[PDB]
Symmetry: D2
Subunit: 212 residues, 4 copies
């Protein structure tokens, strides 16, 4: 039988966009395609407000937009836990938390774009022990992104190359490179972002005067 | 004051996708950005079933999906006229028809991707007289597409370069290259196309067993 | 053992670019990776000056630029036969010509971008009989292009689908999407196209004053 | 008249690619087009071997490959000073070094991809003081990269926004998106990278057996 899988996406979702959503669909089809897994749930987990040097919309807003974006999904949901904690938390700790919840078994895997594998290379950004735990205790499902060569990132990482069994590379045949940075800039200039992010999210943004 | 403009998109819409929809939004912002026009209406006109060597879903279905896709739009509508004619019609004739309807004045402009300008170069595909009428009597609003250099197409076309005043090039800052061919193949393989085309269109496709 | 293969690319080469050259390399690696072919030669065949609606530099120059571009290739050569004819010739006839020239005979395959498969769908552009002969008697090696879905083009064409075993799809992960149209526009404006097309080609264009506004 | 400008690119160049070289050309044309600058030189400065978590070919080799790649450039040269130091050096210090070497003094600007602007946002990666000095005292010329929105990076950074006049954004319409990571993987698998990186660089890699699995 198939191994039940839950996919967790940790990010800013400032705001959530059609690309972020498409990432889950592609990842699920890829896992199902292997014949060994049954994706049963997707979880969007917006980062806490204390994170970064950037000016993120308040977490309750990012969580609300994600929920709106996901109303039409029958398998992906937003979980505010991470954003409700007092402070930012390294991603492995969010994985640990959700793994436990599953117990109160399906495998919990981190879902990210190929761009994330490249960030693993950034000095001091991710503790080696954490990278190892992500691919050894949990799993990593990576969706392609223009300009990134995931197979090379893996081959060149002493840690990743030793845990390839837990790394799933899903190819994105579609050229959908929507940048949330671009979304925010366009919104700020009064330009349309319709068809780039969900309609309900656009309405929410207008209603709450976000990204002005 | 601003010149009222109506944008007409002639295509297969087999099925209509988020890229096709995004094309209108980008074109409108670009025209408004110039300061000289006020886009008042967008029209999607699905091609007639007698067109091509391809197997297109029946026109009533393509028209229905476009209408569903456009329910959330307050300015773009589908007009079945072209698809309801007995036979295929060169595009200039569809422009003429809609121009007349406007009379029962706003300028009517053809909306297309940069890829269309390249098709103007195909031997025997578009009558020179027709290309001329499109850019001289009406107008052409072109939205960028990867791999295409619209400025070069114009510069190299004896006809286009003489009517640059009626050609508006709108740059697509977003990497959204969704191919309807890809959409059909994925649907045929049972893969998700969610977030690539409107939810209501996906439901319609399933309900009517299209693209199997 | 392996089936010997010669790759033929028919196109404007106005001018030849690093992307046109890259296609040969990607196609060769792909065929070798299947383990059943051995590519022994590549042929660049510039189209006749009588062809199409667009303006082309003289074939004399396009053949020259291809020759210069290929000086550092040990397996690809330019063949001016097609452009030396009195008039344009349908691609199937160029394939036939080069096949006869080969006459244990290596297989001759047409090398093209995935966008060519789409053009097969254009009314009146290619004779069905020709499309069939091209895929059946010669074969196609298609290199992917942003925005095109070759697999779908194949599936939606009865002719291509029936002979899909003779259509080899290669994937070049690198964007490239360098269009010769862009190259010509840049040149006309006095901008650099270095590292987009071969240094030797730029020298020829400059020396002979080509592609000026 | 025009302000003389020298462009400095700091990076791995592991190995240098046609895309890295193309960035210099695109950046020069952009600055010239503003009508107020005249680019007089480009400098490729390979990073020190002590840098980062990834494995780099020896700087001896990266400097060599850059020199070979640049033999056909009449304005870009490789400068090994940075890689010859005992240890890695923050980019601002390399800029300071090259500025002193210039000492009517031409302006020295850091040439980079738009993705570098994003990295400025990484906690602990660049000192705010350094980011400020880089944009204020030297300047940045950023060449666009698929997936990145430089204008947004600038607007969302107080430091960059305040000195945005010293950040020059150039647009290369051509995809390219050739990553050195891909180049290294292809080489390791014995695939061709011809027309993606300079012929002279491929010869050196082959002669010295670099980038093997
Ligand atoms: N060391 C870590 O655990 C680590 C480092 C960088 C980013 N992250 C997470 O991945 C996402 C990165 O977001 P940005 O790329 O916008 O900074 C966030 O969810 C962030 O919390 C975790
Ligand atoms: N000569 C003409 O008027 C002409 C030629 C080719 C396509 N078209 C139109 O433009 C669109 C092209 O569709 P395809 O590219 O799928 O063939 C259709 O609406 C078609 O009717 C018009
Ligand atoms: N029916 C045919 O044989 C046929 C049709 C269209 C293009 N072609 C060839 O394709 C190549 C490129 O043509 P384009 O520049 O029109 O895309 C040329 O060699 C041209 O001769 C052949
Ligand atoms: N704080 C700094 O000066 C700083 C930080 C990160 C990268 N860099 C430089 O950027 C270039 C490329 O670095 P990456 O390979 O890490 O992207 C190198 O020259 C590196 O030294 C400088």
């Amino acid at each position: 039988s198939r191994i039940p899988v839950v996919l967790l996406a940790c990010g800013s979702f400032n705001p959530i966009t059609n690309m972020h959503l498409r990432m889950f669909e592609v990842a699920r089809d890829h896992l199902h395609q292997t014949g060994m897994y049954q994706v049963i749930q997707g979880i969007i987990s917006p980062v806490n407000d204390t994170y970064g040097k950037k000016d993120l919309a308040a977490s309750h807003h990012r969580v609300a937009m994600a929920r709106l974006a996901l109303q039409t999904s029958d398998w992906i949901r937003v979980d505010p836990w991470e954003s409700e904690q007092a402070q930012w938390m390294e991603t492995v700790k969010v994985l640990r938390h959700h793994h436990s919840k599953l117990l109160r078994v399906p495998e919990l895997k981190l879902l990210c774009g190929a761009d994330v594998l490249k960030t693993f290379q950034t000095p001091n950004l991710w503790k080696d022990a954490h990278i190892q735990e992500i691919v050894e205790k949990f799993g990593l499902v990576c969706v392609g992104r223009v300009s990134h060569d995931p197979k090379g990132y893996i081959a060149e990482s002493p840690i990743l190359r030793m845990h390839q069994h837990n790394i799933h590379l899903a190819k994105e045949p579609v050229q959908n490179e929507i940048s949330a940075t671009y979304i925010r800039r366009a919104l700020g200039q009064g330009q349309s972002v319709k068809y780039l992010i969900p309609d309900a999210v656009i309405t929410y943004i207008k209603d709450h005067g976000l990204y002005t």
